Each structure stands twice: as C-alpha cells, then as structure tokens.
C-alpha cells in the first residue's frame, strides 16, 4: 500500500531504557 503512513510515530518512547546492561565489560 503506497498510502501507508510515511512518518516516525512521534509517540515513540523518548526515555532511556532503565534495564540496559549496568555491569562492567569483562572483555
């Protein structure tokens, strides 16, 4: 469908993931 919405959905989550890897990088 050529008429599908060509945008970025301005309601996407704008915050930082609080469950991102908080450890150190052992490698």
């Amino acid at each position, epitope marked *: *469908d*050529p*008429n*599908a*919405n*060509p*945008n*970025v959905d*301005p309601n996407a989550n704008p915050n930082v993931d609080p469950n991102a890897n908080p450890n150190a990088n052992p490698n």
Partner: antibody, heavy 121, light 108 residues
Framework: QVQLVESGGGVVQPGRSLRLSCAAS????????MHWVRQTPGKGLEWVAV????????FYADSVEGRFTISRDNSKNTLYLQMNSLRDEDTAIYYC??????????????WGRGTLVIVSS | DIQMTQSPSTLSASVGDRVTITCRAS??????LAWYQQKPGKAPNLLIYQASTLYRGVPSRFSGSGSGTEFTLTIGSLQPDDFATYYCQHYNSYSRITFGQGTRLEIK
C-alpha cells in the same frame, strides 16, 4: 518558516538522465516522508513517488516505474530524485511535497517553489 | 489507478456569491479526499483534508461535504482573493494518488 527549494532543472534530450534536488530548510527533515508531485503545462497534476522517513520503502506511480529513482539523505537535509529513460511526456514543472504526518491522511501541506525540466531536441 | 473527475471545468462568479465545485470518483474512496487551490504562479495549497475537515489557517468560509464517490466544496461567500484553480485529490488506501483536472473560477 520551512521552505523547500528545488534545483537541478534545465533542458534535456529524450533518453538522457537528470538529477533533481529538494534541499529543505528549518524542516525536521528526518521525521517527515516526502513526495514529488508533477504539474504538466496542461495544468494536470500527477503524483510521482514517495519515500518514507528513512528510505525503508519507496513507491512510484505507474508512469515512472523503472525509470525514476528517489533517494533521501537525512544527514544533509535534502531529497533526491533521478530520472532515467526520459522522454517527452515528462515535460512539466516538478513540485516537491511534504506529507502532513497524519495517521492515515496522505495530503501535502508545505509545497516547494518548483524547478522546471524540459525534454526536447 | 482511480480516475478522478471534477465538475464543472470552469464556473464564473462574482464577489459575494456562493459557489459549489464538485468532484466525482470513478470508484468508492470512502472519505480519503483532499482539495487544493492553485493561484497562478504559485504552488497549490491545502484547504480541505478528509473531505470535510478544515486545514489549519484556512478561513471558515470554505466547507466540504460528500462521501463515497460524490463530493463537493462549498464557499459560503466568495471573496476577491478566493479566485484561483481548485483541484480534488484522493489518497484512498491500496490506490495511487491521483488528481482532478482543476476548476477555474473566473471573475464576472
């Protein structure tokens, strides 16, 4: 206040390629899908193509399949559409467009000034 | 594609009059209709979207109506600056964007 200036027009022979640009100003270009609308000298309006916000999907009108390609460069705040296998019935004033951004409304709000392309010999 | 026919091709009128410009679709497009007015030397501008909703910054004197294949623009009081070429453009799903021919509104 968000203006689209097209460039790259002139006069071309049939069968030769040509590059057009739609460098925009003060528009949040990365978030908006853009369109090309073609206005023939017979005051007819034909939609050309659409490129999504990042170029993931591109759609073309039936009249320009396999001949016109449209590319979007969010980094340089500009749009490109290159024509191949050009011929007479593309003699028109080329208009840029910016899709409004509605959920299901495919309409254009901020049109460009337009850049003229002539196919002749 | 969906052919888009609008009538009349030309309709002359005077200042202060009330005019309708209609546009007919070859097949049902629900309410996915848009309208543009093109002043000579300028790009067409948006007036109506969704075939009934007024775009931002458009004076209230313009009004649209219709569903399916029959649609109409109604201008309550024609103004001297409302004199231009008007297009009807649809964006129905699973179809490519097409335009009308363009009604010309001429003084007197």
């Amino acid at each position: 206040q968000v203006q689209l200036v097209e460039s790259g027009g002139g006069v071309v022979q049939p069968g030769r390629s040509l590059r057009l640009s739609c460098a925009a100003s003060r528009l949040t270009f990365r978030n908006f899908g853009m369109h090309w609308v073609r206005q023939t000298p017979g005051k007819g309006l034909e939609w050309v193509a659409v490129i999504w916000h990042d170029g993931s999907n591109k759609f073309y009108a039936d009249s320009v399949e396999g001949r016109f390609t449209i590319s979007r460069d969010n980094s340089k705040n500009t749009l490109y559409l290159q024509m191949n296998s050009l011929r007479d019935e593309d003699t028109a004033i080329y208009y840029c467009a910016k899709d409004w951004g509605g959920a299901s409304d495919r309409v254009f709000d901020y049109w460009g000034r337009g850049t003229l392309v002539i196919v002749s010999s | 594609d969906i052919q888009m026919t609008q009538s009349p091709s030309t309709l002359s009128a005077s200042v202060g009059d009330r005019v309708t410009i209609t546009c007919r679709a070859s097949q049902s497009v629900s309410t996915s209709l848009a309208w543009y007015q093109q002043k000579p030397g300028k790009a067409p501008n948006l007036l109506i979207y969704q075939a009934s909703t007024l775009y931002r910054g458009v004076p209230s004197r313009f009004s649209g109506s219709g569903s399916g294949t029959e649609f109409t623009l109604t201008i309550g009081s024609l103004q001297p600056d409302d004199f231009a070429t008007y297009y009807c453009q649809h964006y129905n799903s699973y179809s490519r964007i097409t335009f009308g021919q363009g009604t010309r509104l001429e003084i007197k």
